[model samples]
Target: HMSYTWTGALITPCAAEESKLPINALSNSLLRHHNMVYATTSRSAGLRQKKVTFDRLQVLDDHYRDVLKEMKAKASTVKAKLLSVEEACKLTPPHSAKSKFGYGAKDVRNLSSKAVNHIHSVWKDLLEDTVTPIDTTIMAKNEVFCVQRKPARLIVFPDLGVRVCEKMALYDVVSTLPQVVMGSSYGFQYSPGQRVEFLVNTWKSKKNPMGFSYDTRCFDSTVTENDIRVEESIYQCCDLAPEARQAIKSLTERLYIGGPLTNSKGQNCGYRRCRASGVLTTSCGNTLTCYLKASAACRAAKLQDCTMLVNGDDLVVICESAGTQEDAASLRVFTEAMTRYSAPPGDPPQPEYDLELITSCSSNVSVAHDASGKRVYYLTRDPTTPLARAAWETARHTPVNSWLGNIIMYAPTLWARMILMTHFFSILLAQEQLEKALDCQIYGACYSIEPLDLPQIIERLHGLSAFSLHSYSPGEINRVASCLRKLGVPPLRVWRHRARSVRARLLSQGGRAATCGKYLFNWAVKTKLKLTPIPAASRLDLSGWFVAGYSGGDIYH
Candidate 1:
């Protein structure tokens, strides 16, 4: 044999094995890529892992297959094409033919400023001329002028600017001119037949000058209720068209691979140097640089390669800059103006006192309760007191009433004050009698009696007093007699009717007047510690006495 060499002795077996390991290392080398493809394309994976997997793969094969199938199925269906220009033009109604135009027309010159103003006025008239509730009449021959003229045929002249004119003026000269007779003085250069033929060809050659054109197929004729109903029926029966389905499928497929990771940069290489160098260059240059820098930073700080980078804090502020100090000063002046306008008026003046101080240095008066449970109060002369004489004097120099002091003196007991008020009112009512009895002072003494005991005094005066022996004055006696008559007969009759009516009302209300009277009597006994005599027993005895007294002789017989 030739020179044989044992390369195994020079190269270590472990080194060879390590160098060949990547050939069977697809599982480890493509781990991130495989995971990324499955995560983004498959629905079962968690979000964070899916994001990582999505970032590592160029394209997900499974998602691509599914999208292809969907697109194929959509593309199988056929759809109608859009109408051609000629067909759309043919659909326009005859009435709206005036609104259409052809090319080769000159631009319209502005007639006048007044004519321009008249345009809007004419347009308004045209809108108002249409059928409306306020004007229901159809167009008559006389009202034809009310309709606005349609916009002139527009013709562009390149750099000179746009021009507008009528549609019929662009025909060839010979076709547009009047035709000549054959045997006339001049040779028949142009005849009616030739002119007609030329005009026909020219008309056919004419093209629309407008960049955009619309046919009034739907607008010319009024839509009837039946037409609308038929259209609605057709629309309701129709499903999603074929073209729409194809479009939706295309959109879905594009959405799946639209992420940045599904591009050329994320593909894997066997060698670490090749893989690292390829990933760090080309389209992913910025991303690779950022990743490497972050890794280096983390390693420098004794951290792992996967350590996260923190974002630098950002400060965002909004401020206004004034041109001069005068502007700022003006702002301050405006603020002061606003404050002055918004401020409230000064506080109100303090009120003056009205009462004078008389008794003591202290103005505040104290009221003390006596052993008999009566309030004994006295006024002080101190000027500082709220109702002092000084305050009262400042209010008005009116003298304080002795009656007010007396009222206050008795005000310690509520019951005594009430009795005093009643007596005071009665004295006011009977002032003449009071004045006459001033020498004896008996009326005044009687006025001091408690109000609760007034009913006893009334009974005693009425029962013990006698009628005078002297004949009463005629006028006085007549007045008294009239009053007595009314008191005796009419009052008794009214009382009887009222009592009977009240008894009937009580009976209607499910009550007995006698039972109510008994309850009232019991209540009175509890409150007053006094008994009420029963009228029932007294009434019965009076009835028996009356019967015996009047019918004694008849009974004896």
Candidate 2:
């Protein structure tokens, strides 16, 4: 089966798109080589289409079915509930797309009678019809990067009404099922601290630990009709409400398996048989499918005591290593098995003896020291993309300021501490917007956070260790240094100097602003303040920060 069948109708853009970073007063200050920073636009949609459109073939054997049966057995223990209209409406982000109907996101959030009535009507229609192919909008994602000019990623999503109905049907199921079925392997359930803990424990649990991250080439494209049906079968095993069951069945047939893709111009762009990236089930489905294939492949390759950590399509498997030669061959066999299951690798997997070398979710485990000289394990990644995106967001006002999200997620990293903090705080101070609230996404859910409260947020999310952590691994430092060189970002010394200035400015403001300087930029000064647990950190509600992956799920918390 082909992932997509295009009708020669182009995926059009509604407005002008910028490929290069727009020069602003703050652009050059963050990054000098503006030419290196670029954003994907509709112009590259054709290339993306070509890359993603392909035929898929799967050969499922007893191993695949065995894993599926086990997953189902675990899934059956779960009981899921349907979300009421108001509950579903409350989950919608403020900036979600408006319905084709007159109602908008604001209307939905306010629980307008008109919106509620239409939602009920949509739910009724789902119960009545189970065969009609639902309509979805296919748009190219405008994501910024440095030097890596990949084609724009495509997002397929149904109408706003249908999305709400999806919430009503599977919100609880998606939220709870993956954690139940996948158990510890479910990667979204962990915070950064917990994630690193799990990885370290998994690595140490084995006598000879080996791991590798499996990169499924366009995982959505690899999804087959049977795979979706299999996923639904697992969901059906759960104790669900009658309405929820019928709605899930209808959504499976109409929206999940395949759908009509409409462009922004309201023309039929094509039909997608792959996973709709923007659906409520996207994260859950990807997690399930990727785990299923990887588990089956692990068995086929005879990998021993395999422990998988899956988040959406990102998979990392730690297991007892065969000798180096045999481990290499085992990975080849594993890759072969995955390919036969229709999820081929973008880069062929190589068994990694070092946990720090295996990157998953664009992050790798690194060792640092806390104030007590005790070794601390934390997750870090190359800062090229984060810095490039920060530079882009600095010049351009994006709806979700990913720079803030990066600061929160990667607070403990050397690059984040020295570069990201110094850069963004300087900009925020210059604009006198440190007190203003900004939107950022953590684990696919959107959050409105204020920069002034970052100290408390960091304390809550990453711990006080984020403030006092130093002496990063040489490999991590080298990666950051090379990334800075590549993106033409300022050197760490320069950022440290700038951070001292930013810290002084922040301290002059007093209040929470001073608190931010006292904690976040303490690394920049010769003498450091004795860091303690923040009082507000204990009171912060960050439960939803890592509950699930919502990358393309159009989710907001």
Candidate 3:
């Protein structure tokens, strides 16, 4: 292999007068000044016998010929579009910084108008005259076609003009040749000639010739809550090298330590100071005291090996015994000694524990019971023990499994439906509240009703309005009937219309075709028996309802 330095230059085309210098004159001049290096016959012969074969040369020749044909076809199309000199001159304006050639605008405009008029006149004259065929004699001037027909010769020594210009006769000879061949004796040997050359080119160019650059400075530089609370920060920040900065930012923003600590006041408690223990003391203060007492009672029962009844004489005796002066003081000391070190009950409705029991093989085994007669089970002895602890920890930390179980267990068939309705209702109610708070009806009077909107309607009827009327509780249905009566719509009429409208909308929006068809049949039968049908011809002429002006199209015809 061989390496060589290469240089390349680009030239742009520009309109010019005959007297002015031609575009690309510099490039043309450079080409003319340089020597047209030719390959030596001896060097060419040696390369032909060693490197490339005749078959490969033929294949390359065919490929280049196809490329040339394609270029010729494209060039023909371009030539057809190329305007005549007069037309070209008409298109070209006089030079001006703002115009074509740095001339005054008035002068450039005048010259351009004159040139266009002249071209139009010439075009008219040409069109009027008898046209003559293009003369081939001048166009067919003799020229050498040597480069078009021949393959490019490989340059072995560019400065010395030594190149490989011929094709080898056999492929086997080229393929089997050793890199180095030893001579007959005396350790004389010759190394294989370098067959490939790599040329490196570097050229200075305008950084952004198109003048395309983003004005990111105009955008806000402040980070968002969404940015800090990203689920996959590591995956998202992969492109930034020297990841230590991002890592530090991630660590600083992580929920494990320096997370947002205040109750919406922008205070930074962090893990070091206002710890989980402190937060529990502040937010959870007296709320869990009863639960703690219940837990203590349960644990006491466990220690005593007897179930503590809620309303029994034993419970009354224990409560009274743990009170009054000297007795209270002694009981407190004993109680502290017995149950102070016991583990706190981790939230009564522990879904994670339920999930563990449901999934585990030992779900039936009863572990502990509370005084309220709520039975509790444990899949393992203690959650702090390595493998078993990890299972509980994972379940607690990522509660998706428990959440999914809850969603599946309660209102199984209509949970998704209820969730969707609730979401929509919540959004509507929020919007209504916003409007009420702002005291500015932005959505117009048409949207303002006594019951704000759909959410308000649902709320007034205890989630039994049109939006959720299909599946409703008995209490909800009664409330809905009362609401309809209060709203001045008859209960029976409101129900009938709501049911019909819902069915219509569902059918029109492509609900199950068979079900919709059945509904339509039933609706048709009921309506036909109770209502009168008007003929098309007897129908009132209501076309004029939309015509506010002298309608252009004929009304009768």
Q: Taking the tens digit of each residue's C-alpha lDDT, what string does model 2 give over 460-556?
A: 8788889989899989889888887887777888988999999999999999999999999998999888788889888988777788887777677
Model 1, 1-557: lDDT tens per residue? 10111111111011111111111222221111111111011111122122211111112134223433332243234222322222222222121111112211111122233322333342243233322111000100100000112111111011100001101110111111111110111111212222223323322333311010111111101112222222222222223344323322221122111111111122211110001111101111111122222223223222211212111110000112233443334334322321222211122111111112111111212233432445433222211111121112222222222222222222222211222222232332333222221110110110122222222222232111100012223432343234324222122233323334333332243322233222211211223222233333233221111111100000100
In terms of TM-score, which candidate is strongest? 2
Instruction: Name the weakest run of 10 consecutive residues (lDDT summed) in model 2.
Output: 547-556
lDDT of 2 at 335: 95
- What's every prediction's RMSD, in angstroms? 54.6, 1.1, 40.6
Question: What TM-score fits each model?
Answer: 0.09, 0.98, 0.17
Q: Enumerate clash totals for all models, in the order shown.
A: 20, 0, 8
Between 1 and 2, whose TM-score is larger?
2
Candidate 1, lDDT over the whole model: 0.20
Better of 1 and 3 by TM-score: 3
